[PDB]
Symmetry: C3
Subunit: 137 residues, 3 copies
C-alpha cells in the first residue's frame, strides 16, 4: 500500500492490529457531517495499490453503532491518483463532528477479478436460477 | 464475466478504465428512486461469473456525493441466473430520476472464500479478543 | 469458517446454496430495529476465519427490498473473538421486528491483501489520475 501525504495534517494509514482487515484513515481537516446528510472528508492522502485489488473505503464499527455513521461511495480504483476523500453518511438526527487526526473510515484492499466481458445469447443454471430475493425466504 | 442482454435497452457492462475495479451497470428502464426511499432498477442483464467470486452491486461515487445515492443489497451469487436488479437507496430529500442507459451502479467481482463450516466448542485469541467497537477507539 | 455457538438460541452459519456467496447469520434474540434507526442484533456466535480474509456482515437482499434494511459497520477482523453482533440500519418509516432464529445478514469471507504500508514522496499516474467523481460522468 503506497501512500503519499499531501499536507502536514494527513496521517499515514496503518492497521490497528496484525489481524486487522483495514488501514485506518484519518481526516486531515476540521469539518462536520450534517444530520441525515453527507459530507466528503478530505484525508490529504494519495495512494497506489497492489495489482488485483481495489481500495474500499469501509466503515468503522464504533462510529456506526455510536453515531449512525456509514461510508458512502468508497470504490477507489487502482488508477485513482487524486486525494482520497472519505464520503460519510450521517443517518442520525444530529451533526457528526470531525476534527483533524480523527479516524473516520478504514481502507480495505479487496481482492477482485477483472476479466474481459463476454456477451452471450443464453445462460444455463444450477438449481437456483432466477432464484430471487429471499431465494429461500 | 459472461453477460446475456435480456432486452434492447440493456447495456453491456464495461469497466471505464483499465485500472477500474468495477463494470458499469446501466438501467434498461425509466424509473425514479423516491426521496428517503428505495427502488429496484431493472438492468435487463443476466450474468454468470467466475469461480471463487461473487458480483457485488457497488455504488458509483458521483451519485453518492451529488445525489446521496447508495446501493442496497447487492450480493449477487454465482448461482444467480435471473435479471440483475440494482437496489438503489435515495437518502436525499428529493426524487432521483433514472432513465434508460443511465449508469446506476458498478459490478465488482469480489474474490471470496467459501470453505466448509466447522462448529467448535471453544476459540483461542490473539491479543485482540472480544476487542469490540472502537477496539482502540 | 470456525464457529462456536455461545447460547442455545444461536444458529450455525450455512450458505443457502452451493453457489451462495454468504453464510446465513441468524439472530439469537428477540429485538427490534427502530424506524429510521439502528440496532445491534446479537447472534451468539464467535468465529475464527481463514488466513487472508475478513468476514463482512453483508445484507440480505429480501430485507433490503422489502423492509429498507441494510447492514452497517460489518468489518469483522481475523483477530476478532467476541460475539458477532449484526448492526442493522432501518431506513423505513416503521420498526423492523426481529425474533430468535430469524436470518438477518449473511457473512461473506472477503479475500483481501494486507501488505506493509510504504510512505512515498510522489506517485505517478495512468491516464486516469485525479480522475474524480464521475470520472467519465
Amino acid at each position: 500500500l503506497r501512500v503519499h501525504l499531501l499536507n502536514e495534517h494527513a496521517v499515514l494509514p496503518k492497521r490497528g492490529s496484525a489481524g486487522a482487515a483495514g488501514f485506518d484513515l484519518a481526516s486531515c481537516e476540521d469539518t462536520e457531517v450534517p444530520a441525515r446528510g453527507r459530507a466528503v472528508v478530505k484525508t490529504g492522502l494519495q495512494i497506489a495499490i497492489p495489482p488485483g485489488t481495489y481500495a474500499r473505503v469501509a466503515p468503522r464499527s464504533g462510529l456506526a453503532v455510536k453515531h449512525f455513521i456509514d461510508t458512502g461511495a468508497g470504490v477507489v480504483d487502482e488508477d485513482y491518483r487524486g486525494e482520497v476523500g472519505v464520503v460519510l453518511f450521517n443517518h442520525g438526527e444530529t451533526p457528526f463532528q470531525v476534527r483533524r487526526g480523527d479516524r473516520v473510515a478504514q481502507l480495505i484492499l479487496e481482492r477482485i477479478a477483472t476479466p474481459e466481458v463476454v456477451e452471450v445469447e443464453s445462460l444455463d443454471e444450477t438449481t437456483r436460477g432466477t432464484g430471487g430475493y429471499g431465494s429461500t425466504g
